[PDB]
């Protein structure tokens, strides 16, 4: 099966704003999807959680400096607010 564009956009914005709170496997990512989005559709929730898990698995194999500066910017935005 293919991934819907709105699933891609939701996964992008979720992994962009809340990368710190997401975990490794599917269950804790689904939990973060539960208390970060109300997400009335179950299949959309499952596809979003699976694609966010795949996205963070792809990201965690990359360089560390981008993750570090992203966490620094997220901490700065959280402290400013």
């Amino acid at each position: 099966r293919v991934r819907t564009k709105t699933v891609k956009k939701a996964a992008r914005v979720i992994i962009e704003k809340y990368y710190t709170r997401l975990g490794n496997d599917f269950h804790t990512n689904k939990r973060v999807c539960e208390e970060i989005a109300i997400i009335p559709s179950k299949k959309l929730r499952n596809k979003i959680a699976g694609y966010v898990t795949h996205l963070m698995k792809r990201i965690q194999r990359g360089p560390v400096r981008g993750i570090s500066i992203k966490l620094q910017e997220e901490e700065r935005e959280r402290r400013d607010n």
Binding site: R61, G62, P63, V64, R65, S68, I69, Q72
Partner: peptide, 14 residues
């Protein structure tokens, strides 16, 4: 510091 200027070496070696 936290901005490692050689942090891609670990993915390259991996």
């Amino acid at each position: 510091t936290l901005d490692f200027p050689r942090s891609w070496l670990l993915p390259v070696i991996r």
